[PDB]
Each structure stands twice: as C-alpha cells, then as structure tokens.
Curated annotation (Swiss-Prot), chains C, J:
Assembly description: Part of the SNARE core complex containing SNAP25, VAMP2 and STX1A;this complex constitutes the basic catalytic machinery of the complex neurotransmitter release apparatus. Recruited to the SNARE complex following binding of the SNARE complex component STX1A to STXBP1. This complex binds CPLX1. Found in a complex containing SYT1, SV2B and syntaxin-1. Found in a ternary complex with STX1A and VAMP8. Interacts with HSC70 and with SYT9, forming a complex with DNAJC5. The interaction with SYT9 is inhibited in presence of calcium. Isoform 1 and isoform 2 interact with BLOC1S6. Interacts with CENPF.
Name of protein: Synaptosomal-associated protein 25
Underlying gene: Snap25
Function: t-SNARE involved in the molecular regulation of neurotransmitter release. May play an important role in the synaptic function of specific neuronal systems. Associates with proteins involved in vesicle docking and membrane fusion. Regulates plasma membrane recycling through its interaction with CENPF. Modulates the gating characteristics of the delayed rectifier voltage-dependent potassium channel KCNB1 in pancreatic beta cells.
Occurrences of domain t-SNARE coiled-coil homology (ranges): 9-61
Species name: Rattus norvegicus (Rat)
Annotated segments matching region Interaction with CENPF: 1-61
Family, similarity comment: Belongs to the SNAP-25 family.
Protein's cellular compartments: Cytoplasm, Perinuclear region; Cell membrane; Synapse, Synaptosome; Photoreceptor inner segment
Post-translational modification comment from the UniProt entry: Palmitoylated.
UniProtKB/Swiss-Prot annotation, chains D, H:
Gene giving rise to this polypeptide: Cplx1
Basic and acidic residues: bias regions: 1-29
Localization in the cell: Cytoplasm, Cytosol; Presynapse; Perikaryon
Region (Interaction with the SNARE complex): 17-39
Subunit structure: Binds to the SNARE core complex containing SNAP25, VAMP2 and STX1A.
Protein name: Complexin-1
Family: Belongs to the complexin/synaphin family.
Native organism taxonomy: Eukaryota, Metazoa, Chordata, Craniata, Vertebrata
Tissue: Nervous system. Strongly expressed in brain, where it is predominant in neurons from cerebral cortex and thalamus (at protein level).
UniProtKB/Swiss-Prot annotation, chains E, G:
Post-translational modification: Glycosylated.
Positions carrying Phosphoserine: S73, S75
Protein name, UniProt field: Synaptotagmin-1
Binding site for Ca(2+) 5: D34, D94, D96, D102
Domain remark from Swiss-Prot or TrEMBL: The first C2 domain mediates Ca(2+)-dependent phospholipid binding. The second C2 domain mediates interaction with SV2A and probably with STN2.
Tissue expression profile of the protein: Expressed in the brain (at protein level). Predominantly expressed in rostral, phylogenetically younger brain regions, and in some endocrine tissues.
UniProtKB/Swiss-Prot annotation, chains F, I:
Residue stretches making up the t-SNARE coiled-coil homology domain: 1-54
Entry's family note: Belongs to the syntaxin family.
Purpose: Plays an essential role in hormone and neurotransmitter calcium-dependent exocytosis and endocytosis. Part of the SNARE (Soluble NSF Attachment Receptor) complex composed of SNAP25, STX1A and VAMP2 which mediates the fusion of synaptic vesicles with the presynaptic plasma membrane. STX1A and SNAP25 are localized on the plasma membrane while VAMP2 resides in synaptic vesicles. The pairing of the three SNAREs from the N-terminal SNARE motifs to the C-terminal anchors leads to the formation of the SNARE complex, which brings membranes into close proximity and results in final fusion.
Protein name: Syntaxin-1A
Subunit structure: Part of the SNARE core complex containing SNAP25, VAMP2 and STX1A; this complex constitutes the basic catalytic machinery of the complex neurotransmitter release apparatus. The SNARE complex interacts with CPLX1. Interacts with STXBP1. The interaction with STXBP1 promotes assembly of the SNARE complex. Interacts (via C-terminus) with KCNB1 (via C-terminus); the interaction increases in a calcium-dependent manner and induces a pore-independent enhancement of exocytosis in neuroendocrine cells, chromaffin cells, pancreatic beta cells and from the soma of dorsal root ganglia (DRG) neurons.
Gene: Stx1a
Length: 38, 54, 61, 47, 152, 54, 152, 47, 54, 61, 54, 38
C-alpha cells in the first residue's frame, strides 16, 4: 500500500518537472529553428 | 508470488529518484542555454541590421 | 466459487507483469535522459563557440 | 563587358528557399503543438 | 485562433459487470472546416485494442452549430481483466464534409494516454460505478493517429 | 477480494503514469537530437562566416 | 525537543534587473518524522503573491541526514514595482514520506513577514545587489499556512 | 438499601474530561509556540 | 532617481515594520480575550465553591 | 527616457499609498490596544475577587 | 504630491508615541496580574493539598 | 529623510516593548489555562 502510494507520488513529481522541461525545450526548438536559416 | 512485485516496486522507486535529479539538471541547463540562445539572436540581429544599413 | 479464484490469479499475474513493464519503462527512460544530458553538453559547447564567433564578426565590422 | 552588370539572381534563390524554409516551419509548429497538447502544456502566451 | 475546440464527456466503469459507459455531453469552440458556412458536428467513439478497432459508435448530427449539446450515452462490454488494455478514441467530425476531409479534431483515453486524458481515465478507474465528466482539448487527427499507431 | 481489484487498478494507474513519464523522456531526447542537427547547421553557418570575415 | 530545525539561506535582489535570488545553504537539527529512520530532506521555494502560487522550485534530495548541505541557487524574475508585494515560502520536506504527511517545517519572508524573517527581507532590500545569508527557525506548517491565508 | 454504597462513577467523568482538557491544552501550546516563533521570542527556559 | 528607489525601499520597510507591530497588537487582543473567557470560568468555579463553603 | 518617468511616477504613487496603509494599520493597532487595556481592567477586578474568594475558602477550612 | 506623504508620516509618528505608552501601561499591568495569578495558584494548591490530606 | 528614520526608530522601540509584553501574556495564558479546570 505505502510502496504504491509513495511510488505514484514520486512519479507525479517527476512528471511535473519534466512537463516544465518539455515546455522549455519547445521554446528552445522555436529559437533554434529561427536561427537555422535566416 | 507477491514479494517479487514489491521488490520491483522498490527498484522502480530508486530509479524514479534518479530520474528526478536528472530532470532537475536538464531543466537548469535548458534554462541557461535558453538565455544564451537569446544573446546569440540579439547579436545575430545586430549583425543583420548593421549589414542592412550599409 | 470456481470462476472467482481463476479471475483472482489472473489479476495477480497481470499485476506482477505490470511491475515488470514498469521496470523496463523506467530503464528506457533513464537511458533517454542520460543521452539527453550528453547531447546538451555537446550542444552547449557548440553554443559557446557560436556566441564567440558572432561577437568576433560584429567586432570586426 | 559593356553589360557587366549581370543580373545577380540570388534573390530568387534565397526566396524560393526561404519559402520552403517557412513551409517546413509551419508543419513543425504543428508537431510542437502536438507535444504541448499531449501532455497538457499551456504555451507562454497564456497567463 | 488555430485551435480545434473542446469536447466534454463523462466516463464510467463497473468492474463486476465489466461495463464501460461514455456519455458524450457537449462540445464548444469547434473550428470551422470551411469559411462562410457552419458545421454539422457529430462524434465517433471507437473502442480499440492492440491497434484494432473493436466497436464503433456515433452520435446524432446537430446542424449549423459550433457548440453542440448531445448528452448521448454509449456502452461497451469490457471485462475487468481487459479494461486496462483498451483505448477509447473520441472524434468530432463535420457531417457536411462526409466523404472528404471529415475530422475537426480528436482525442483518446486509456492505455498510453497522457495529460488530462490519462488523469480522466485514472479518475474513472479510481471511482468505480461513478461517472466522472471532464473537458478535453481536441488534437489534430494526424498527431493522434501517429500516437495511436504505436501503443497496443 | 476487493483489495486485489482496487490494487490492480492503482497498480496499472502507476504503470500508465510511468508510461507517460517515459514518453516525456523519449520526446525530450527526440527534440534535443533535432535541435542538435539545427545547431550543427547554425555553427557551420557562422564559422563559414567568421572565416569569411577573418 | 519538539523543535523542527533551522534552515540557513541567502537572499539577493537587484532592483534594476528585477532579479530575486534565493540560495538554499543548509539546514540543521531537523526533526525526524518517524522514529528509527532518518529523513531524505529537500526544500521547496514558492514565490507567492496575493495568496496565489507564482513559481515553485525544489532542491535535490540528500538521503539519510538531519543536517543537509545544499548550496543551490534559484532565481525569480520580479520587477521592482512588485518586489514589495511578494512572499517567499521555504519548506523542508522528507522525500521518504512523499505522498503522505511531507512537511517537517517551513518559514516565509516578505510581505507580512515578522521577526527574523522580516529583518532578513528588509536586510535584502536595504542592501541591493548583495546576498545576505541568515538562519531561520522552522515553524509548523499549519501555523504558517494560517498566516499565509491572510496576507496578499 | 443493603447496597447503599452506590458506585460513585464521577472518577470516570473527571478523567474522561481531564483527558480532553489535556488534549485541547497540547494544541493550544502549539498555537502559543506559533506566536513565539513568529515574532522571535525565546521562552523563559532559554537563558 | 536613486533617491526614489532607496526611499521606496525604506518606506515599505517602515510599512512592514508597522504591519508586524499591528499583528502584535491584534494577537495581544486575541489572547487577552481568550484569557478573559478563562477567567470567567475560573471565577464562576470559585464563587460556586465559595457559596459552597459559606 | 519614456519608461523611466513612468516607472518613477509608479513608485511615487505606491509610496503615498504605503503611507496611507500605515495610517490604517496604526489606527487599528490603537483600537486593539485600547480594547486590550479595558479587558485587562475587567479581568483585573475579576482576579481580585478570585483571590479574595480562595482566601475565604481556605480561611473557612 | 509629496507633501501629503510627509503629513501622513507625521500623523503616524504621533500615533506611534501613543502606542509606546499604551505598550508600557499594558506591560506593567500584565506583570502585576502575573504575580497575582501566581498567588492565586499558590492558594488553590493549598486548598488542593489540604483537601487531599483529609 | 529624517522623518522616515525617526518613525522607523519609534516603531522599532514599540516593537521591542510589545515583544516583551507578548511573552508576558503568553505566560499569563499558560497560568490561566492551568487554573481553568483542575
Ligand atoms: Mg555552458
Ligand atoms: Mg488590580
């Protein structure tokens, strides 16, 4: 019980962090696509 | 029959901890490089307008 | 009765197999994240040299 | 030559390319939005 | 704008009976396929497993509207040992363009679902015999179809 | 009996969560790879230009 | 004992750039959530305004310790017309109890802060572009949350 | 009565109450410490 | 220009100090009120006891 | 330039509003302190009569 | 535009003086009543032990 | 300048006094809570 609850909470935390990171790297893709050829 | 299952849950928990700190590291690096790329775009536009004027 | 025990063993087996799939998934996630970090290192150095290059070109002008 | 002002047609090479270089961009932004929607990410424009 | 619209629908699962129920509630802010006209929206519900289409269901049509209200309930017979292996695919289509480019947008829930879709699925499985209603941003059909060609 | 039904539900809920996290890591690696090709092209641009000004 | 522990951290503000920087330095004498084990402490930093959570940040985990050392720096973009309207909330949590009762203790600085917390905030604003480090006694989360439901 | 020594059960009334009268006390001391910490007050025990 | 930046800082510093003082007065009034309820109960105790001894 | 004057007027307005908030806060503090003093008067008299009562009860014993 | 501000500061200063002497008064009263409550607890414990012995 | 400095000093003094008073009244709350029912 506690093992499953704890693991779920840990997963949820890393999913939050990674969601933020994916937004940031999508900004990165936008900016780098601008600089790719202009 | 159910001990193996909680052992797997234990391993998964540890790896999740490592994935947490990996995600933090790559977040910080993406931030720094993001504003570095901002600087690069500022300098590129500077060369672009300074060429465009003459 | 007879069906309840069978379905019970079924759900148990699927649960264990579920934890095994979790193990595979977090392993492949870890490999992906490591590769991502290495790539961010390489590209970071590349970005340093791009910045230096453009600052040199605008210093020459 | 008396007509040495040759027509530097690079303008139609940097435009027929920057056209494609824009089309491929639009498609890519679709992909980018595809990611944002899939995980439920509001772009920086919101809030 | 460039947005497709949102669909609100409810999910319900009864593990003992193995009954899964999708009530299509409403949709809002649907994108117009063509300019100058308005759509005749309807909704398809595909229950899917291992990338193969099990049962398909359809709502009625609502003419001349971008904000349809449906409240139409569809049920699929899915045993509890299999409920965690399926995917429900919800598509909003323009009946006026049937036979050509149909889809406005679509979404899916269940196995390998992500974001609001996954939290809705899990909400359903965590609240047995209780319908949970949620909104969902429609996603372009090519992206979702790519996502659906992968998982089982 | 109910312990096993509810637990199967939250177990596969954990698996679905982990599969979404996995997808996030995979898409991160894909995007960063593409941007790596981009940065290759960019840097050859500005070094085939910094060798053009020097 | 009944005490929660102390956290040392530094504060820095640059009015022109509108940059606020919190370096989490260390913590000491943390209370054990459970007997017989030791904690995996980490720190959350919530920047907050009008009772709403703006940005949230987290340190890494340090396993098996009640006296962690961090030295991890976090920055928030806060303009000078708004710097006097915010609150920084610092929470120490046990990662081993994530998903249940997490918090060991917490503290906050800024608007409607009191005591050492207020004198630290004011020290920061009185010494622009200079990081001031200070210790802080952790307070129970229910008291601090009550204090935080009031001010804006 | 022959058993007029009735069991005066007030002991379980002044104990089931003094129990609560202690619990409510603990909580209150938390509040009190909440005040002391908030303004930075060392209780008389220190120094 | 700097006079106004620094002065805004020390002005709102005065406001924060005054808000802490205000909180002290409010908590004083709250506590004294509660202790007033307490003293009510205490005095009814010992007057319902001094009328019990007299 | 154009932004500097705007931000300057902004900080000025917030400063004046800050003094007004100070005025409100010290008014409410003064009311709280007065109420506190009145309550300490009432409770002080109550305490006098508690002391007298207990001394009477222990004098009767 | 800034005269009103120093007028407000003046008023605040006066009220602060009054709050100073209020705080002194209530401090002295709290002291006196504190040792009065000490006496009351001594007498209450006296009645408690003198009842407890018989 | 001097008005702000003076007012700050006055506030700080009253905050010291009131801090002492709050400690004293917390002692008062302790003692009165003892006598409330025993
Ligand atoms: Mg670097
Ligand atoms: Mg008196």
């Amino acid at each position: 019980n506690r093992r499953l609850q704890q693991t779920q909470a840990q997963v949820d935390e890393v999913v939050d962090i990674m969601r933020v990171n994916v937004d940031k790297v999508l900004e990165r893709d936008q900016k780098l696509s601008e600089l790719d050829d202009r | 029959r159910e001990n193996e299952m909680d052992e797997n849950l234990e391993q998964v928990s540890g790896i999740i901890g490592n994935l947490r700190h990996m995600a933090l590291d790559m977040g910080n690096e993406i931030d720094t490089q993001n504003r570095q790329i901002d600087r690069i775009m500022e300098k590129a536009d500077s060369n672009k307008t300074r060429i465009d004027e003459a | 009765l007879e069906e309840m025990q069978r379905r019970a063993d079924q759900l148990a087996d699927e649960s264990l197999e579920s934890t095994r799939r979790m193990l595979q998934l977090v392993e492949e996630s870890k490999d992906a994240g490591i590769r991502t970090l290495v790539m961010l290192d390489e590209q970071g150095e590349q970005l340093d040299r791009v910045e230096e290059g453009m600052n040199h070109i605008n210093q020459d002008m | 030559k008396k007509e040495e002002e040759r027509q530097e047609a690079l303008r139609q090479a940097e435009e027929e390319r920057k056209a494609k270089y824009a089309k491929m961009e639009a498609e890519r932004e679709v992909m980018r939005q595809g990611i944002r929607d899939k995980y439920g990410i509001k772009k920086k424009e919101e809030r | 704008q460039e947005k497709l619209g949102d669909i609100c629908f409810s999910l319900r699962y009864v593990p003992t009976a193995g009954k899964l129920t999708v009530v299509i509630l409403e949709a809002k802010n649907l994108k117009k396929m063509d300019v100058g006209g308005l759509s005749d929206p309807y909704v398809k519900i595909h229950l899917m497993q291992n990338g193969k289409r099990l049962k398909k269901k359809k709502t009625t049509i609502k003419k001349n509207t971008l904000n349809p209200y449906y409240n139409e309930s569809f049920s699929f017979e899915v045993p509890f040992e299999q409920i965690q292996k399926v995917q429900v695919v919800v598509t909003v289509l323009d009946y006026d363009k049937i036979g050509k480019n149909d889809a406005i947008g679509k979404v899916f829930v269940g196995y390998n679902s992500t974001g609001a879709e996954l939290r809705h699925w899990s909400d359903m499985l965590a609240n047995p015999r209780r319908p949970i209603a949620q909104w969902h941003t429609l996603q372009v059909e090519e992206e979702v179809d790519a996502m659906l060609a992968v998982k089982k | 009996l109910s312990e096993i039904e509810t637990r199967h539900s939250e177990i596969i809920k954990l698996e679905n969560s982990i599969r979404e996290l996995h997808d996030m890591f995979m898409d991160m690696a894909m995007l960063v790879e593409s941007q790596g090709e981009m940065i290759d092209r960019i840097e050859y641009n500005v070094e085939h230009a910094v060798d053009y000004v020097e």
